[PDB]
Amino acid sequence: GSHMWIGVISLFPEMFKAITEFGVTGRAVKHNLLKVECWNPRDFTFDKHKTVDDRPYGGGPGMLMMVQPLRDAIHTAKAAAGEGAKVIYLSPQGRKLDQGGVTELAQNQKLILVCGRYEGIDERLIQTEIDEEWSIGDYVLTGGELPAMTLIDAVARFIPGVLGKQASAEEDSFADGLLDCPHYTRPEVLEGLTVPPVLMSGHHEEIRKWRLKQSLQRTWLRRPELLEGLALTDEQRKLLKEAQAEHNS
Amino acid sequence: SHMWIGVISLFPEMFKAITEFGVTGRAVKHNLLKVECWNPRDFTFDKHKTVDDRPYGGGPGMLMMVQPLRDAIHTAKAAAGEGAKVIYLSPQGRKLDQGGVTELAQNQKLILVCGRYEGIDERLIQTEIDEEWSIGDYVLTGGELPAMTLIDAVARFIPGVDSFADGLLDCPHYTRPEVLEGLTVPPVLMSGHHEEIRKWRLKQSLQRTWLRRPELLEGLALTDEQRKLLKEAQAEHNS
RNA sequence: UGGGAGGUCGUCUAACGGUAGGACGGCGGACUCUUGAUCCGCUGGUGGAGGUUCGAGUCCUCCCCUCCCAG
Ligand SMILES: Nc1ncnc2c1ncn2[C@@H]1O[C@H](C[C@@H](N)CC[C@H](N)C(=O)O)[C@@H](O)[C@H]1O
Ligand SMILES: Nc1ncnc2c1ncn2[C@@H]1O[C@H](C[C@@H](N)CC[C@H](N)C(=O)O)[C@@H](O)[C@H]1O
């Protein structure tokens, strides 16, 4: 079957239950499609006080993570993963994640994700132990665990069998480089807003064209830059032109 | 002054990841942050506690059921009282950045709706949501991680607890030992002269922002000092 | 509203001139789930008149509606 192994270095491994025990990802773990193993630098501290942070040279802001426990946890994980494992550091200074980046990352059979805490980690550990740096966004969080879980989740949607029997038709934003179209479910009418008749028509071809047209229109209006480097069928061009002409004028 | 966050989620226990650990966890124990959850499942009225439903027009996937979700949001909105903004986590919403974080931070109470499956009914977005927010241009299986990400980012602004502070990437950091794998700490950081260090670190932030994320640089009004240091760094990059 | 072609459940697709079926949809139900998974019932059609024939979705006439070709 399909399997992916993700090694994680984190002071708070229990946080990862958030993805391993719940939802689609929880079932994927429960079906062995996805494996996540964690190592905690705290289990590697020679300190009698199980101390895991150290002071930054130059004084200043907060604390940095202590080098020894963190380095030892990385070497232990790296050794267990064996050969062919790419080591990633979660950091806001890293490559900003997008769907293309998710597909590329999804190209790895094994990954080790290093989650920082405090002011971050010693720059030299990054030079000597890290392969790639990735950011989940231009904002600062208190630790790398949320970013790591985010990365894991995004790639897990790409593991065959995770979403279910023939999930090729499963529609989500960016999946095909376009934003998703709007969705509707029961009731037929509530809060005075009805459902577009075409979705109730049972007319298959029109529903397909409506959905595609909605997706093009929404992408155009909210995120056109996605539109700048896209490959499209004649049908998509036509459908988009209809949409731009109609919202406009 | 503290922050209150309402959350609508089918998996409220996921939020322990932020309420029981690290800085945000400490914030919770000291009552500097409250995170209350409502689960649409507690609002169902059927034998199987159904919280999803099929989308009209057929095809694969499910959407969240309108009624339980709606009822939960109205209940949370009711508990929050006046002034609570309802935010829906979605990849089609406004992309979070440090500015968006500061604006969200102004709000005293927020309610966060976490989607699952293929999403939520469009009419709920039109009728119950004030603003839509995305954590990035990629797709997740649920809104819980994005909700926690947002909560974590804004919590940093809660009294009693910088990179992006000035629009720049952070500078590199070092701690003991002085030599690690043949790599020594830059002498300036050990010189003990606060002024030389400040200028060195600032020069590093400027250089790094330029090299990794030059676009961040376009929107800024650098001080005379910053312009000089960046100019120096660009000259060193390829002299 | 000139010259060709064509009308079957909401849509798609079958039926020798012999009891109109299937898939999807819509409604509803089980799975005993967090099932973005899979099953199971129910609903529903020959556009309309004539006529031929023991019998017509099918063949003939007319009417109507629809697509294609220059309004
Ligand atoms: N946007 C982000 N993407 C990836 N990791 C992040 C992000 N924001 C914070 N982190 C991680 O969580 C912690 C953030 C803080 N320790 C501050 C980090 C520090 N500003 C730095 O330059 O790395 C670090 O471990 C970061 O790696
Ligand atoms: N980029 C994102 N930012 C914030 N929330 C997200 C993001 N991606 C997915 N989600 C959450 O994940 C839930 C389930 C998603 N599969 C829904 C995606 C939806 N079909 C769309 O493409 O717009 C969504 O309802 C959101 O709550």
Side-chain angles (χ1 to χ4, degrees), chain B residues 194-204 206 225 229:
Chain B
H194 65 279
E195 178 65 3
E196 320 173 58
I197 289 172
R198 180 185 70 77
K199 292 183 308 181
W200 181 86
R201 285 185 172 153
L202 179 43
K203 180 173 179 176
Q204 286 289 331
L206 291 153
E225 175 201 57
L229 292 176

Short mmCIF file of all heavy atoms in Angstrom, two decimals, chain B residues 194-204 206 225 229:
data_model
loop_
_atom_site.label_atom_id
_atom_site.label_comp_id
_atom_site.label_asym_id
_atom_site.label_seq_id
_atom_site.Cartn_x
_atom_site.Cartn_y
_atom_site.Cartn_z
N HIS B 194 27.26 46.77 22.82
CA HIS B 194 25.85 46.76 22.39
C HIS B 194 25.58 47.47 21.07
O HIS B 194 24.76 47.02 20.27
CB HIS B 194 24.95 47.31 23.50
CG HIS B 194 25.20 48.76 23.80
ND1 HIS B 194 26.24 49.19 24.61
CD2 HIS B 194 24.58 49.88 23.36
CE1 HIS B 194 26.23 50.51 24.68
NE2 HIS B 194 25.23 50.96 23.93
N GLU B 195 26.24 48.59 20.84
CA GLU B 195 26.00 49.32 19.61
C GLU B 195 26.49 48.62 18.33
O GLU B 195 25.73 48.53 17.33
CB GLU B 195 26.61 50.71 19.72
CG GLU B 195 26.45 51.50 18.46
CD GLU B 195 25.00 51.80 18.19
OE1 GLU B 195 24.15 51.41 19.03
OE2 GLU B 195 24.73 52.43 17.16
N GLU B 196 27.69 48.02 18.38
CA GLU B 196 28.22 47.33 17.20
C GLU B 196 27.34 46.14 16.89
O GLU B 196 27.12 45.82 15.71
CB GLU B 196 29.66 46.82 17.41
CG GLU B 196 30.66 47.71 18.17
CD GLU B 196 32.03 47.00 18.46
OE1 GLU B 196 32.71 46.56 17.50
OE2 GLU B 196 32.42 46.90 19.65
N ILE B 197 26.84 45.50 17.95
CA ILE B 197 25.97 44.33 17.81
C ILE B 197 24.63 44.70 17.20
O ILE B 197 24.20 44.07 16.23
CB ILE B 197 25.75 43.65 19.20
CG1 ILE B 197 27.01 42.93 19.66
CG2 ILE B 197 24.59 42.66 19.16
CD1 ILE B 197 26.92 42.42 21.07
N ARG B 198 24.02 45.78 17.69
CA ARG B 198 22.74 46.22 17.14
C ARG B 198 22.89 46.47 15.64
O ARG B 198 22.09 45.97 14.84
CB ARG B 198 22.27 47.49 17.82
CG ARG B 198 20.93 48.01 17.30
CD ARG B 198 20.58 49.34 17.95
NE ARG B 198 21.50 50.37 17.45
CZ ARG B 198 21.43 50.94 16.25
NH1 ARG B 198 20.47 50.61 15.40
NH2 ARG B 198 22.33 51.84 15.89
N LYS B 199 23.93 47.21 15.26
CA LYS B 199 24.13 47.50 13.83
C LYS B 199 24.42 46.23 13.02
O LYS B 199 23.97 46.12 11.86
CB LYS B 199 25.25 48.53 13.61
CG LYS B 199 24.87 49.94 14.12
CD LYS B 199 25.95 51.00 13.84
CE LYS B 199 27.34 50.58 14.33
NZ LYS B 199 28.40 51.61 14.08
N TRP B 200 25.19 45.31 13.58
CA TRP B 200 25.45 44.05 12.88
C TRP B 200 24.17 43.24 12.66
O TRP B 200 23.91 42.74 11.56
CB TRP B 200 26.43 43.21 13.67
CG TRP B 200 26.74 41.94 12.99
CD1 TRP B 200 27.70 41.72 12.04
CD2 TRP B 200 26.08 40.69 13.20
NE1 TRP B 200 27.69 40.40 11.65
CE2 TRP B 200 26.70 39.74 12.34
CE3 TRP B 200 25.02 40.27 14.02
CZ2 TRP B 200 26.29 38.41 12.29
CZ3 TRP B 200 24.62 38.94 13.98
CH2 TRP B 200 25.26 38.02 13.12
N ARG B 201 23.36 43.10 13.70
CA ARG B 201 22.12 42.33 13.61
C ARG B 201 21.13 42.97 12.62
O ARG B 201 20.49 42.29 11.80
CB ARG B 201 21.46 42.18 14.98
CG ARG B 201 22.16 41.17 15.88
CD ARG B 201 21.36 40.98 17.18
NE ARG B 201 21.85 39.89 18.02
CZ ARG B 201 21.70 39.84 19.34
NH1 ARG B 201 21.08 40.82 19.99
NH2 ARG B 201 22.16 38.80 20.02
N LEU B 202 21.05 44.30 12.67
CA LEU B 202 20.14 45.00 11.78
C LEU B 202 20.63 44.79 10.35
O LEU B 202 19.84 44.41 9.46
CB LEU B 202 20.10 46.47 12.16
CG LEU B 202 19.21 47.40 11.31
CD1 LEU B 202 17.84 46.84 10.95
CD2 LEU B 202 19.09 48.80 11.93
N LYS B 203 21.93 44.92 10.13
CA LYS B 203 22.49 44.69 8.79
C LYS B 203 22.17 43.27 8.31
O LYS B 203 21.97 43.04 7.11
CB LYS B 203 24.01 44.92 8.79
CG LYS B 203 24.70 44.71 7.45
CD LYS B 203 26.16 45.14 7.55
CE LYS B 203 26.94 44.96 6.24
NZ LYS B 203 28.34 45.49 6.37
N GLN B 204 22.24 42.29 9.21
CA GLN B 204 21.91 40.91 8.85
C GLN B 204 20.41 40.75 8.47
O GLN B 204 20.07 40.01 7.54
CB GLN B 204 22.26 39.96 9.98
CG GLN B 204 23.74 39.78 10.04
CD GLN B 204 24.24 38.97 8.87
OE1 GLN B 204 23.52 38.11 8.33
NE2 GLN B 204 25.47 39.27 8.43
N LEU B 206 18.45 43.01 7.20
CA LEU B 206 18.30 43.68 5.92
C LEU B 206 18.85 42.83 4.77
O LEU B 206 18.20 42.65 3.73
CB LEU B 206 19.02 45.03 5.99
CG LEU B 206 18.35 46.05 6.90
CD1 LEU B 206 19.37 47.06 7.45
CD2 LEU B 206 17.19 46.72 6.21
N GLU B 225 19.96 54.98 8.27
CA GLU B 225 20.81 53.92 8.74
C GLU B 225 20.53 52.60 8.04
O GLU B 225 21.45 51.88 7.64
CB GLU B 225 20.59 53.79 10.24
CG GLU B 225 21.31 52.66 10.92
CD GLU B 225 20.64 52.31 12.25
OE1 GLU B 225 19.42 52.00 12.25
OE2 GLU B 225 21.32 52.39 13.30
N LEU B 229 23.15 50.49 5.65
CA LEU B 229 23.55 49.13 5.95
C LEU B 229 23.18 48.12 4.85
O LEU B 229 23.95 47.23 4.52
CB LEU B 229 22.97 48.69 7.29
CG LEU B 229 23.54 49.41 8.50
CD1 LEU B 229 22.82 48.98 9.77
CD2 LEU B 229 24.99 49.08 8.61
#
